[PDB]
Structures are given as C-alpha cells and as structure tokens.
Design a protein around this ligand. Structure first.
Ligand SMILES: [Mg+2]
Ligand SMILES: [Zn+2]
Ligand SMILES: [Zn+2]
Length: 224
C-alpha cells in the first residue's frame, strides 16, 4: 500500500512501489470547484520519467523541486499522454529546467490545431516510445482513440504499472468530458490495453482512485 511522500495544497505525491509514484494536482480553470488530476512518476537509479505535467506551472515546480531535493534525482523526460491541460499545463516549467519532452506526433498536430506549440524541440514518436531509465525501461504506447484521438498509455513492466491517463476511468466514474472523445472506439481501445497488460498490478487513471486491471474492465463496460 501507499505512502504519502509530499503534500501541499497544490500537489500530492503518493509512493505506490519502489519505482512508482503518483502525482496529484488540481485544475481550477473556471469559477467552480478544482478537479483532481493524476500523473505518474517513474523512478530508477536516481533518474525520473514523468507522465503528465501537473496542472500548472507552480504545481509542476513543486514536483521538480521534490524530485531534485527529496528523491535526489534528475528528471530525464516528460511524456504528456494527450493534448489537454491536465497533461501539459505546466509544460513551461519543465522546459525551463531543460527536461526533454517526448510526445506523439498526433498529439503535436492536435496541439497545433488548437494554437499551441512546444517551445523547446520535442522528441516525437508515432505509436510507441521506449525510453531507458537507468538500467530499466519505460514505455508509452498508442492503442487507439478514446478520451481523445491521441491518448497514449504509460507502462513500466518492472513494477507491473500502467498509467492509463484519461483513457482509463476509476471504478464507478461517470463518462466525464466527451467533447474530444471517440465514443465509438473507446471501449475496443481499452480492450487492447487489457490484452497487452494481463499482469498489471498498478493502474493509474487520469482522475480518481488507482487500482488494478478492474479499472480496464470497468472502463470497457462503461463505453460499451
Ligand atoms: Mg504488467
Ligand atoms: Zn483530456
Ligand atoms: Zn483528464
């Protein structure tokens, strides 16, 4: 089970295993309640890969400073899992620490369709990304359209860990925001994620409580 290793009004970090930490930050984009938004920190040999910026610059700086001063580590790469602001909201702060961004090509196109470009040159991938993190490996993979057309999934096999992002719901979630979604394909997409990760023990959805592969099952059935 999970240790809280950092907590503040702007940022919560939960330690789930020896290599896998969950970061939680809060979107306040309108005149209504803030919404909790999850990402994944993968740690190995004092090197860190982050799936999803926290929601803004100040939350992202709390995360970077936590990695530097408390995990005594370097962040070697940022992988935004799609183009919404619960994935790239703090991108400027990461770019200002010269953290390499790794992002899919469809994600770049949708960002550009929406008027945004990364400032620092990105490292781009079509469907699948393999990154070395010291002597272990971390992956991002595109399985199909869901929550958005570009959504990718993070995977660290050493701890059997999957960052579902917003393609994956928590147990008993509502459907949520569908403005950019492909509802005809969401569930077949997650069937593929399930097929690829039968031994997953840690599955982190984009919002709400993490758990096991039952998050896959629940999300498949939600959009059937
Ligand atoms: Mg696994
Ligand atoms: Zn989204
Ligand atoms: Zn989301």
């Amino acid at each position: 089970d999970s240790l809280i290793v950092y907590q503040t009004e702007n940022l919560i970090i939960n330690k789930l295993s020896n290599h896998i930490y969950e970061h939680i930050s809060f979107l306040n984009t309108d005149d209504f309640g803030k919404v909790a938004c999850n990402g994944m920190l993968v740690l190995n040999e004092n090197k860190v890969v982050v799936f999803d910026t926290p929601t803004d610059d100040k939350s992202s700086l709390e995360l970077i400073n936590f990695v530097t001063n408390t995990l005594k580590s370097e962040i070697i790469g940022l992988i935004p899992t799609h183009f919404h602001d619960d994935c790239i909201g703090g991108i400027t702060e990461f770019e200002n620490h010269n953290i390499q961004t790794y992002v899919s090509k469809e994600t770049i196109e949708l960002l550009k369709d929406n008027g945004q470009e990364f400032s620092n040159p990105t490292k781009d991938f079509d469907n699948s990304l393999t990154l070395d993190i010291g002597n272990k490996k971390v992956y991002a993979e595109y399985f199909g359209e869901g929550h958005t057309k570009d959504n990718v999934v993070g995977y660290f096999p050493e701890d059997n860990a999957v960052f579902g992002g917003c393609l994956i719901k928590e147990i008993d979630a509502s459907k949520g925001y569908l403005g950019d979604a492909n509802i005809k394909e969401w569930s077949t997409t997650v069937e593929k994620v399930k097929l690829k990760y039968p031994n997953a023990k840690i599955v982190i959805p984009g919002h709400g409580k993490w758990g096991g592969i039952e998050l896959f099952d629940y999300t498949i059935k939600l959009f059937e």
